[PDB]
Write a protein that binds this ligand. Structure first.
Ligand SMILES: O=C(O)COc1ccc(-c2c[nH]c(CNC(=O)Nc3ncc(Sc4ccccn4)s3)n2)cc1
Ligand SMILES: O=C(O)COc1ccc(-c2c[nH]c(CNC(=O)Nc3ncc(Sc4ccccn4)s3)n2)cc1
Ligand SMILES: Cc1cc2nc3c(=O)[nH]c(=O)nc-3n(C[C@H](O)[C@H](O)[C@H](O)COP(=O)(O)O)c2cc1C
Ligand SMILES: Cc1cc2nc3c(=O)[nH]c(=O)nc-3n(C[C@H](O)[C@H](O)[C@H](O)COP(=O)(O)O)c2cc1C
Ligand SMILES: [Ca+2]
Ligand SMILES: [Ca+2]
Ligand SMILES: [Ca+2]
Ligand SMILES: [Ca+2]
Lengths: 307, 307
């Protein structure tokens, strides 16, 4: 099977493992790319030399295509722009801001640019400035969120633009992934579920937090970031009532690296209640792709001959 | 095609026009039922005598199945429970609370009860007291909302229960409706788009504000949290909360729906309002949703064939 995304990136499955701060090292990314998806290295707030070690890690693991995520609120944003170009990266995703100022530089470098868009207006602007595709991220996602859900944003983005759309936010199995294709997308982007992958270097405490979570276990803090509820999210809310960087500084690192799941930031999506097994990256990819195929096929049998 | 909902309810299409305070009178619920879906009179906050007039109006328009919505925050809840049983209404949907104390009375009346549920724990419990089906409503929906999205709530509720699930929130076309079926749903509930139906008695001003809205033109107010299209009321209400209500809130929806005061009334509508761009008959809407979905499911299955 083929979609414009499998053709554009030269990959087996129309699935991205979304770039994540701290979680998406060369190990996670490498395992995804290896099995046939697009593994994506999360730039995050990391210095150039930390992100570079990751790019080196991945190349030594596989020759398959890979992306690098540039998170536009990073203090080292300009260094990572240099880096993706310098290291020969073919795909760039961008998140948490407008990447417009870097678009011509990326395209002169032969790089494929796929921004994350939170609205139809920004989706269209990206199309008119040359963007090769866009990612519509719903508010149900883990991490730094917009306002619109996946249901409404994907459909309205897909309708507004002629470039290919990718659904992100709230997908953790084949049924969820196939829904993304119905809303008009040609690829899915998955975050929360890849965190529990065997190759993921997220601390056992962070993985077990996700695994035990119920549907309602997430909250939005710092109004904006979706995370699993703990002492830190309760602290922040209370200090929101009172009125602050003592809490917020290094919070994700505390969680992802050191396993402090009380005082750390345990970002994860509303779909974490559906995630309850540790698997390899390949086992996750196959479940999403063949799980979707199966469900699309079963529904077509139901609706067959209707006109 | 057949779903467990089409067979429980004996309806031609697995689509509910969602029970809506003020909007969902007899003429709208009639046209939906007459065209072959499930039209639903919304009880809202209305006295027993007003809802009876609606029930009286619908029976004279169509012989086909119809539902009545019981909104549980109503001052007149006990009377609307009475009313449905006395007038031989065969289906009841509920919203804004827990209907558990009414379950045994409804079933002794031979009534089919379909509660809206905001979580997995409430879906499971409704299943355990004998509910015939539930509605999963996402926070993207118009009106009074929970915290989970359609993408994530419908997945996790379809998964937790063996009774049929109906997907609500963010569906205005066949691609949207197909997506809901993909997540585990056996029918869809549509609100926003039915407001602009030719047979809807919503004020031309109110229909105009939907037709001209963008994806981003809704906001959450009063977080009883209501989703509505941004205007002077939402601006004044947000500010009134900001520094710190019944003077502003009282009768707000009636002012917009009936009188067309879309400046200072509550224009409840979903994030999918940016997609709703024309006035159509109820039948034209039902047919677009149904056959739109069919063609999208059929299209994607030829794309995925052999996988
Ligand atoms: O320019 C504007 O204001 C509008 O433009 C945009 C606004 C928002 C977005 C957007 C929303 N979501 C995303 C992708 N998701 C994310 O970026 N989620 C993230 N999680 C953890 C992150 S790390 C971090 C975060 C904050 C501070 C320091 N570090 S980023 N992009 C894209 C474009
Ligand atoms: O266990 C509990 O605490 C109660 O559980 C529930 C909690 C929430 C819900 C729920 C949320 N949304 C829905 C279905 N949607 C709606 O109920 N939407 C509505 N729009 C306009 C309405 S009219 C109104 C509303 C408030 C005050 C005065 N009038 S109701 N049900 C259902 C059950
Ligand atoms: C822990 C965590 C960190 C993330 N970091 C980034 C990031 O640095 N840049 C970005 O564009 N998106 C970031 N995201 C979003 C993901 O790339 C992806 O779009 C999202 O997880 C999809 O939603 P889901 O969690 O339901 O699967 C992050 C998400 C999580 C959960
Ligand atoms: C104006 C308006 C009034 C509503 N009133 C009720 C109600 O009284 N009881 C209820 O259970 N749901 C109510 N709802 C929810 C709808 O029946 C339906 O589930 C919802 O609108 C679906 O989301 P959508 O707007 O994206 O289609 C209302 C929705 C709107 C837009
Ligand atoms: Ca398109
Ligand atoms: Ca490891
Ligand atoms: Ca089920
Ligand atoms: Ca009329």
């Amino acid at each position: 099977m083929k979609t414009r995304i499998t053709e554009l990136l030269k990959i087996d499955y129309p699935i991205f493992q979304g770039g994540m701060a701290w979680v998406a090292d060369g190990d996670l990314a490498g395992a995804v790319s290896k099995a046939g998806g697009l593994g994506i290295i999360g730039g995050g707030n990391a210095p150039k030399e930390v992100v570079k070690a990751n790019i080196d890690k991945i190349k030594s693991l596989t020759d398959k295509p890979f992306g690098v995520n540039i998170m536009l609120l990073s203090p080292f944003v300009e260094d990572i722009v240099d880096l993706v170009i310098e290291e020969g990266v073919k795909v760039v995703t961008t998140g948490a801001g407008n990447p417009s100022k870097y678009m011509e530089r990326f395209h002169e470098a032969g790089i494929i640019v796929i921004p994350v868009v939170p609205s139809v207006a920004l989706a269209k602007r990206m199309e008119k400035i040359g963007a090769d595709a866009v990612i519509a991220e719903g508010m149900e996602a883990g991490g730094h969120i917009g306002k619109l859900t996946t249901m409404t944003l994907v459909r309205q983005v897909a309708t507004a633009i002629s470039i290919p759309v990718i659904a992100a936010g709230g997908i953790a199995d084949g049924e969820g992934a196939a829904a993304g294709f119905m809303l008009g997308a040609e690829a899915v982007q998955v975050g929360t579920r890849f965190v529990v992958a065997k190759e993921s270097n997220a601390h056992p405490n962070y993985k077990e937090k996700i695994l035990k979570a119920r549907d309602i276990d997430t909250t939005i803090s710092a109004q904006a970031v979706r995370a699993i509820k703990n002492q830190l999210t309760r602290d922040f809310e209370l200090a929101e009532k009172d009125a602050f960087e003592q809490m917020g500084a290094g919070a994700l690192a505390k969680a992802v690296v050191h396993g402090d799941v009380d005082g750390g930031s345990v970002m994860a999506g509303q779909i974490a209640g559906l995630v309850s097994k540790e698997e390899t990256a390949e086992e996750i990819l196959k479940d999403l792709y063949y799980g979707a195929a199966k469900k699309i096929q079963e529904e077509a049998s139901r609706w067959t001959g209707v006109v």
